[PDB]
Amino acid sequence: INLPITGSMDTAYANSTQEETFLTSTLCLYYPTEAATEINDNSWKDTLSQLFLTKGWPTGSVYFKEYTDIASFSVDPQLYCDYNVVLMKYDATLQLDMSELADLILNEWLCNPMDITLYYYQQTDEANKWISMGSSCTIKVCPLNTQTLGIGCLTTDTATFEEVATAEKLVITDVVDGVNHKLDVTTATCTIRNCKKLGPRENVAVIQVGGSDVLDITADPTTAPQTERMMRINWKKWWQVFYTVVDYVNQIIQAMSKRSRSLNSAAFYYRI
Amino acid sequence: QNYGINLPITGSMDTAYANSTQEETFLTSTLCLYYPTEAATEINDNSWKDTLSQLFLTKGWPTGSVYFKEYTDIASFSVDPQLYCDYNVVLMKYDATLQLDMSELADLILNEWLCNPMDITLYYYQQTDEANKWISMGSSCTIKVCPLNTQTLGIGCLTTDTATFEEVATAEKLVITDVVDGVNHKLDVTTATCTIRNCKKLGPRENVAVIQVGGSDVLDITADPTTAPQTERMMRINWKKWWQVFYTVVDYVNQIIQAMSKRSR
Amino acid sequence: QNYGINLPITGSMDTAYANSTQEETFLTSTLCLYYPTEAATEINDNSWKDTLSQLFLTKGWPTGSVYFKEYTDIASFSVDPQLYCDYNVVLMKYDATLQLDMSELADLILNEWLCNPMDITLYYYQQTDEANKWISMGSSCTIKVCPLNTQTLGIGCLTTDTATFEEVATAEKLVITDVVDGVNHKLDVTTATCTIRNCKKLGPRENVAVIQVGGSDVLDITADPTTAPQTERMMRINWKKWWQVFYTVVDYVNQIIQAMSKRSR
Amino acid sequence: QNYGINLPITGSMDTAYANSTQEETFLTSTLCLYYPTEAATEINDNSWKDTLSQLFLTKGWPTGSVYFKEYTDIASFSVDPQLYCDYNVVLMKYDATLQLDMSELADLILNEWLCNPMDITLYYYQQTDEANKWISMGSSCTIKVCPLNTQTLGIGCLTTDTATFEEVATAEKLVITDVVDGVNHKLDVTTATCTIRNCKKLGPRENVAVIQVGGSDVLDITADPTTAPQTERMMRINWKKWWQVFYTVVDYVNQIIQAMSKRSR
Amino acid sequence: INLPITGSMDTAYANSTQEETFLTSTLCLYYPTEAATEINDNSWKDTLSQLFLTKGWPTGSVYFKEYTDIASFSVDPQLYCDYNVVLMKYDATLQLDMSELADLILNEWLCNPMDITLYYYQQTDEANKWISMGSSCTIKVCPLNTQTLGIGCLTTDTATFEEVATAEKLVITDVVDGVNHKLDVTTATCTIRNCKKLGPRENVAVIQVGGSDVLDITADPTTAPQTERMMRINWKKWWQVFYTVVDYVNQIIQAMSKRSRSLNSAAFYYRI
Amino acid sequence: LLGELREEFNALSQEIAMSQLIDLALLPLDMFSMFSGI
């Protein structure tokens, strides 16, 4: 709504919305199969629910959704909850994969599809990128000139293109903004969409269960920001991790904030 | 440009009616038809899509704004319908054996749902108001419910003997379940094949327009058996062919876009 | 001279800064470094202690005020650390496989704890606020906990079958356990080898300074995962020789002693 | 047009913003990238330099202003790094076994050093302030140091027996040595293979920009362990290829050049 | 600093900066192998050190630098000292070499590189010359007329060029300022750079140990100046020369002044 | 390949003077006069 807001400074602080946002909201943890395996129990979910019930979160409000691995989760994350917590392990090989996962879930995207064989697309601003998901996306790019001819590449020979992605389940390609590129992609396995980044998704919350903070949300190498809903833990077990989560969940939900844009079950808005 | 707030609006009655937005929204928006494989079968033409696009060109819509998206059957379309366009039209055939299925499809796509997940195994859920329902999708769903009493025991069903439960669905691709609102229910569902979500019904989705190409109007969008409404974007047609239907749609698309309004969310 | 009492104290803003306590605190205080066996092994000298003391002498610290106290390993040091010196420094090696151990060591020494005993067999303990934790020292601690409901029954475990308990520690020399705050836990520990105390966290210990000789800063002092702070007495260095490390420490000892502040108790 | 003089500058707060220097400073300046051999190896192309130059052409940097200067390894680049350009970008791979080498490199290039020569055989030197150090370059430097008392006698080392000296480096292609500032040291170096220079750290060279392509930020520029700062021109990327890295550098070169400022010396 | 300076004439002269500039500066002698040869000693450096220690220059301030040949020194001199002195033997067969060396180190140069094959260079003013360094620089040049054709030469035939140098280690080429010259140079063994001359270098002091003054710093045969940091000695030995230098070092440092432009270790600034 | 052209225009905006600009804004700078100094 484009209309303006007004207020004052004599008004008083109203009562606490905590202990009611729990009653009228839902929470959803996303943990790894490694945790369930280390635990080797069946009623740990009911245990965590009966624990949450003391902190206020009622029985039918908490949810646990397993994901086999970081990349498997990155492939089409179907986050549909009023509060999402994600626990993600550290791996120097999956550093970029779990930075792209962050860039995807933390932020809200407006995605338009792409027709590669029939058209050739470009980028406009510093927030219009190309996100490709699927089993294995092997993307190659050849920039072109004003008269539709290759620059350091051959428009026919795919082996002369510049391979930016080699066998990656989730790729977020940023290229030079202003020039037309031609793309070679494994359309039979992966789908690639030109997505503009909107404001942040305040509904999710990442927790790096392992090493130091490495996630670089903003693709420019000058900011390197550390947002509110990006926590870090050191671990040797998972029960201690879940107990820490439960004991400090009110802070997590105080650092999160229900969305404003719209209701949607996808991790990105689709508007053709 | 405030978001996530509701502010009072103002106006007047002296302002003049501005020029028409048709022939500008037709360019700055997108259109998406959904047709049945029976139509393409009866047609047997590989250029009907470009033909209809060139016909839309006369009515205003440019060439790269219209899309045709096939679907084999009403149920195979009801299974996870991911509608993402700016103006959606759906064609639907009449089949008394699919009355309730293609009424659930209508109640699903026409309306806008706020959907949270469900954990059958652990929790026993209940419906608060008349607009909280449980919608299940998948290849083949088999749902069985058991209400509970005040003391967490069954009422005509046993919390262990699943067979005692009451069967509301039998091998359905889409189900919309409304149960007595105010009692805790236990569920049994083959969750391997189907996913069930607890949804709340909100204001209608003004982006989609259903067109029943066949018999009389049976679609009861609202689950209460008192309204039985017929909305603006809920159309009916009599048919013996499909080229005539598509020509009708093309000639009366402006009426369709006048009966539809872009989303609010 | 009223001890044990806290009374309001006053001041002003017209006064002028007094002389430098530095160059006198060195003489009137004591220093105590904690280096690893690896360091003296790389050095392979029998007079490096007196060498560093003669060097310190140039910075002001007299001969019999500085002390060196070796430690075989990080866990063997964490097991009952007795830091009784008016200025303590610790050199800590980085290891990915020891991250939680060398973060618990930090949270245990950098902060001042008020610890009460704990009789597992006889009582059932809980936590009150976000600073009441359970600190377990010893050679090999294997801790298991079962949370309980209102009526002293189990929750996902059985109070008689120890195997049903939840394993939070597995053969660790130091653990700092935080559990949900407001529920009773029934514990099982190998109390022959490990002692567990119910400790509350007070304001920080400003008398000890940690120096991470290796990789990036990882020490999460705060049990709450949101903050992840980095205080003034948690320093970091990159190293290839321990002589270079010790020369750095000696050359910048004054900044360290400025980042540290004697105890109030 | 006074040179080597410093005088009071004056101004006001009503001035209009004069110009907008980007797209002119680019034309009238020169940029120089320093990439590793790993990148060209992964690329396997003989025209990628011209390609990147044509790309920069869009950003405004013309053809004969962008330069590339390969380097085999961090050590080979640290050996006498002759950075002579109006803007310098450096790509730097992460390796836990090279943290100190690639921190010394950062401390050397990022900062502007005033370096006098050193003659070890005759003279015994001492560091005056905290910004005075001894930087040794060459194929392989091996440094040993004996601090000395007031009567030019060793402390833990024998002036005649070099083996008694304390080793601070072992076949390093670049060392930056900081020792106790205020005592005279007798040195031993492989002078026939490597040269040591007594340097003083002035303010920072705003002409270079380091970009760690891999791991977390570890570069401890400041020798003292208390600050461990991180400037504007100390960047970090996560990578799995190099074409994406170069495209990112290109697309965000303007930010890099806003982070860099032409030299004052 | 474009801003101006103001002063007066009533102020009193301040105390002598001598006896402190020694402590806060360093001095570096450059001496030929002939000197160490005729000396035939190994402690002459410590002797001169302890002599400077009486003259007021402290122990860790003095440095010496053997240079095998005048040309070997001319090949990339690396001067980084707050005071530099250079003892230069006389040789009529090296007049132009040790005049070019003089013009190079006594003054301050701002240098850009030169790509002879990709470009054709020229001069702008009478101070924009081409200094070539290396082990054997054989240079040839063709001036081009108004219509990019050769004058007494051919753009294709290198034999027709005019050979300005012949197997030299340092050449300072000045040509007609305002015409485009094509070049041919032993780019493998020598690098040639287009340098503009700037305000002088008051940090060095040349001392010709032999015959009468010949050094023509100024490349035009109209000035023939003689500066203050260009000294001359008559010699039959070297120990007497070094004793002279020691006894009259204060005069040399009065004749010299620390640089003003910036810090650097070479005989010239590099600005691409 | 405007992203940089606009910035060049906004750098050249105020450097231009006012008196001479008003002196030049009264001239019929027809096609020849407008494309001659280019």
Ligand SMILES: *[C@@H]1O[C@H](CO)[C@@H](O)[C@H](O)[C@H]1NC(C)=O
């Ligand atoms: C807000 O809190 C105060 C203090 O607990 C209480 O008196 C008041 O009733 C609360 N507000 C409402 C609307 O109940």
Ligand SMILES: *[C@@H]1O[C@H](CO)[C@@H](O)[C@H](O)[C@H]1NC(C)=O
């Ligand atoms: C709408 O129609 C009127 C009447 O022809 C015309 O004056 C007006 O410009 C039109 N609106 C627009 C936006 O062109």
Ligand SMILES: *[C@@H]1O[C@H](CO)[C@@H](O)[C@H](O)[C@H]1NC(C)=O
């Ligand atoms: C404190 O410092 C001042 C200034 O340096 C000095 O005059 C005074 O003597 C010092 N105080 C003492 C007790 O020495």
Ligand SMILES: *[C@@H]1O[C@H](CO)[C@@H](O)[C@H](O)[C@H]1NC(C)=O
């Ligand atoms: C300058 O020299 C005079 C005479 O030797 C002496 O009296 C004076 O103290 C000196 N100046 C200073 C600042 O010491």
Ligand SMILES: *[C@@H]1O[C@H](CO)[C@@H](O)[C@H](O)[C@H]1NC(C)=O
């Ligand atoms: C900015 O413009 C003024 C005149 O408009 C000019 O004198 C000045 O040199 C310009 N700034 C730069 C950095 O060239």
Ligand SMILES: [Ca+2]
């Ligand atoms: Ca990836």
Ligand SMILES: [Ca+2]
């Ligand atoms: Ca190529």
Ligand SMILES: [Ca+2]
């Ligand atoms: Ca981009």
Ligand SMILES: [Ca+2]
């Ligand atoms: Ca159905």
Ligand SMILES: [Ca+2]
């Ligand atoms: Ca029954």
Ligand SMILES: [Ca+2]
């Ligand atoms: Ca109901």
Ligand SMILES: [Ca+2]
């Ligand atoms: Ca531990």
Ligand SMILES: [Ca+2]
């Ligand atoms: Ca707690």
Ligand SMILES: [Ca+2]
């Ligand atoms: Ca259990």
Ligand SMILES: [Ca+2]
């Ligand atoms: Ca090194």
Ligand SMILES: [Ca+2]
């Ligand atoms: Ca020794």
